[PDB]
Scaffold this active site. Structure first.
Site, mmCIF file in Angstrom:
data_model
loop_
_atom_site.group_PDB
_atom_site.id
_atom_site.type_symbol
_atom_site.label_atom_id
_atom_site.label_comp_id
_atom_site.label_asym_id
_atom_site.label_seq_id
_atom_site.Cartn_x
_atom_site.Cartn_y
_atom_site.Cartn_z
ATOM 1 N N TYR A 467 107.585 44.338 72.945
ATOM 2 C CA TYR A 467 106.301 44.489 72.272
ATOM 3 C C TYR A 467 105.152 44.198 73.227
ATOM 4 C CZ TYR A 467 102.338 42.793 69.473
ATOM 5 O OH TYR A 467 101.081 42.536 68.972
ATOM 6 N N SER A 548 104.494 48.364 67.014
ATOM 7 C CA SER A 548 103.052 48.216 67.177
ATOM 8 C C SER A 548 102.641 48.538 68.607
ATOM 9 C CB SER A 548 102.610 46.805 66.789
ATOM 10 O OG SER A 548 103.384 46.314 65.709
ATOM 11 N N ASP A 631 100.146 52.633 55.508
ATOM 12 C CA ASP A 631 100.085 51.271 56.021
ATOM 13 C C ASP A 631 98.790 51.046 56.791
ATOM 14 O OD1 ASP A 631 100.675 49.726 58.808
ATOM 15 O OD2 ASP A 631 101.590 48.648 57.124
ATOM 16 N N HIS A 667 101.126 52.663 46.851
ATOM 17 C CA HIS A 667 100.709 51.844 47.982
ATOM 18 C C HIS A 667 99.775 50.734 47.516
ATOM 19 C CE1 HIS A 667 99.576 50.771 52.074
ATOM 20 N NE2 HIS A 667 98.306 50.894 51.732
#
Length: 697
Positions: A467, A548, A631, A667
């Site tokens: 990451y 991410s 998201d 959502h």
């Protein structure tokens, strides 16, 4: 394959950004609200499903295998107190943990002592805080309910373990501080946040205020001990000395690490509790850095101190004169836990993202180590008067292990108090190790590789996880997905801490942030060379994945060595640095990237943006991108842009393109376990399919 694909539309739309007419032929999928984007997403899901239709049998097999690793009893550190072993347990189908006692190390059937799951019809309250006592007659624990201060807090004894009529009301973020047989200090506020004449919506809970409390008596028979009058917008707690004749109080302004130290003389037992708080001797009245009490000995006190040392050095303090001396000057790493027992300071260092233990005497401060396995601390229990000590290590293929020992000769007393069990594991067969290799220019870079007892070769699948950013390192912790990778397909797991994260802290951020960030994506690529030069696996088939910003890097490395890899997966990542600050909370990471309107920032950015560097002819690995359609952590327009552009730019070259997506209705609510479990199953069956992993038959 030479099959057709949905014609990802291209438009003349091109925002001329910084006098450069960059084409944006996919302005369609910059907003979910269009029908075109919805239909394109539907086609992407349909194509991914069609590709996986034949392998769906093994996909369901591995999905069941990963799902079977979601229920697991989990224990914790032990505590030998008053001839009993108090420790925590968990069955798997419940939502809080239980506490109970055992007669000895080798107890067969324990005896339940604290069940927070019963006293409430909702049964949602949990033990937020705990405290023993000198007489060990009662365990003062806070039962926090749904976060808010509207709470029920109870008490059960030890010799009888019924519940006494005593409650601590109107308290949040409490540090119970017990002293002999009288009682404990605890936090609360004036007016007891009483309603009727109440406002402010419980914002900031002004005027923190610690006061004593004696069991048996009603709430009103208590003596206040300290409340910051001048600076009510603070938050403080207190604890008692080992002699239990003195009290110390720590204070904190907001969430600032900076701290000031105030000691005090607790009134003796013969006079009950004094009418007035005695003089609270002032030792540190400043806001330099975080302090933390660890112990005392007569005229001495010892603290973990971050003052003039962001790596949390350890220093003693004297009261009656104030002249000072240093115990441990900070080492090359940072601190995780520390303790002071009998005649030894026992410390744990987060060296290269792994906790190493040391014990230090009172004449020779040399850091004598123990051969504890590769991992990190997750819990710690220690008492000054008890020679028994224990701790808990967690790692990738070490889901949790509680060890215990004494403080006389720590070599041979180390032993496994408790080992958690998940079906289908032998532990020792999967050995983990760390290895350093030179960077692209010659600075050592670490690598945590977990692999069998020499049962893999050039043919074994090799996976990389990274990451690398936002000052948050990927510490060694168990994940069921890595468990299935290790035990179900014969692969090895190589996690590299590339520059940018919190492996070395702010300096690590400085090594890989903003302008000097680019070489980070270079160094990771160099890693792929080393792991193939050494001998572990072959470049002919390899896998990488990350999330991410990591999902960014696994795509950025597609520029420097496009042909070298064979399959990669990117999840919830940033895939277009030209719409970075213009949408959602993304701009909040300016400190990492910067806006696309600053001159030098955009100059550095435009050479590595993934959407401006995919290019035909060249050879590319198999790419999977997984993304949720709404998201708000990272808006999914970037992923759709990436997948569509290279779907319609390099058809007959290295690939293919895979666009796993999370489309649904509703959502804005929580994420149940079904979604994450199925997505992990899908991504892991993809990797197992492509990098040629041999299933454990």
């Amino acid at each position: 394959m030479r099959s057709v694909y949905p014609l990802a539309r291209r438009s003349m739309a091109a925002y001329t950004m910084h006098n450069m007419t960059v084409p944006e032929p996919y302005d369609y999928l910059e907003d979910p609200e269009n029908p075109e984007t919805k239909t394109f997403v539907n086609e992407q899901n349909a194509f991914f499903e069609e590709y996986f239709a034949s392998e769906a049998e093994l996909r369901k097999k591995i999905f069941e295998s990963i799902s079977n690793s979601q229920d697991y009893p989990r224990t914790s550190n032990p505590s030998y107190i008053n001839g009993h072993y108090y420790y925590y347990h968990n069955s798997g189908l419940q939502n809080q943990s239980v506490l109970m006692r055992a007669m000895s190390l080798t107890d067969t059937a324990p005896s339940i002592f604290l069940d927070p799951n019963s006293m409430s019809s909702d049964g949602t309250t949990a033990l937020k805080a705990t405290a023993w006592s000198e007489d060990e007659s009662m365990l003062a624990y806070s039962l926090s309910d749904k976060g808010s201060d509207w709470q029920r807090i109870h008490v059960r004894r030890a010799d009888t373990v019924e519940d006494t009529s005593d409650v601590i009301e109107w308290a949040k973020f409490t540090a119970i501080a017990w002293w002999h047989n009288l009682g404990f200090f605890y936090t609360r506020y004036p007016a007891l946040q009483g309603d009727v004449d109440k406002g402010a919506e419980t914002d900031a809970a002004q005027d923190a205020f610690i006061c004593f409390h004696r069991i048996g008596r009603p709430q009103d028979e208590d003596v206040v001990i300290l409340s910051v009058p001048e600076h009510p917008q603070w938050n403080m707690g207190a604890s008692v000395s080992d002699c239990h004749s003195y009290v110390i109080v720590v204070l904190f302004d907001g969430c600032e690490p900076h701290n000031l130290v105030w000691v005090a003389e607790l009134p003796s037992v013969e006079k009950g509790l004094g009418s007035e708080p005695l003089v609270f001797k002032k030792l540190v009245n400043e806001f330099a850095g975080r302090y933390t009490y660890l112990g005392n000995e007569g005229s001495t006190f010892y603290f973990v101190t971050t003052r003039d040392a962001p790596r949390k050095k350890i220093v003693s303090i004297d009261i009656h004169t104030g002249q000072e001396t240093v115990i441990v000057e900070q080492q090359r790493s940072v601190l995780s836990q520390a303790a002071l027992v009998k005649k030894t300071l026992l410390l744990a260092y987060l060296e290269d993202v792994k906790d190493v233990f040391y014990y230090c005497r009172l004449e020779d401060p040399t850091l004598n180590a123990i051969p504890l396995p590769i991992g990190t601390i997750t819990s710690f229990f220690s008492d000054r008067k008890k020679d028994f000590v224990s701790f808990k290590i967690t790692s990738f293929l070490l889901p949790g292990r509680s060890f215990f020992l004494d403080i006389n000769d720590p070599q041979s007393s180390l032993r496994v108090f408790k080992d958690d069990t998940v079906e289908g594991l032998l532990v020792d067969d999967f050995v983990t190790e760390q290895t350093f290799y030179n960077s692209s220019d010659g600075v050592r870079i670490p690598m945590f590789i977990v692999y069998r007892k020499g049962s893999v070769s050039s043919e074994s699948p090799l996976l990389l996880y990274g990451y690398g950013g936002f000052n948050i390192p990927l510490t060694p912790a168990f994940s069921s997905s890595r468990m299935v990778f290790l035990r179900d397909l014969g692969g090895v797991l190589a996690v590299l801490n590339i520059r940018g994260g919190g492996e070395y802290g702010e300096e690590w951020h400085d090594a890989g942030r903003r302008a000097c960030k680019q070489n980070c994506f270079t160094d990771f690529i160099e890693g792929a060379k080393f792991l193939h030069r050494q001998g572990y696996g072959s470049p002919q088939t390899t896998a990488i994945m990350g999330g991410s910003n990591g999902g960014l890097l696994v795509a950025a490395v597609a520029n420097q060595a496009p042909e070298l890899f064979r399959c990669v997966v990117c999840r919830v990542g940033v895939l277009d640095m030209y719409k970075f600050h213009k949408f959602t909370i993304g701009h909040a990471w300016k400190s990492d990237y910067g806006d696309p309107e600053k001159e030098e920032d955009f100059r550095v950015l435009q050479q590595y943006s993934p959407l401006h560097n995919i290019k035909s002819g060249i050879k590319y690995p198999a790419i999977l991108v997984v993304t949720g359609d709404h998201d708000d952590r990272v808006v999914p327009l970037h992923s759709l842009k990436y997948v569509a552009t290279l779907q319609h730019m390099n058809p007959n070259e290295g690939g293919p393109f895979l666009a796993r997506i999370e489309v649904a209705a509703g959502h804005g609510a929580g994420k149940p376990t079904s979604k994450i479990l199925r997505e992990a199953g899908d991504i892991y069956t993809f990797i197992a399919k492509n990098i040629n992993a041999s299933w454990k038959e």
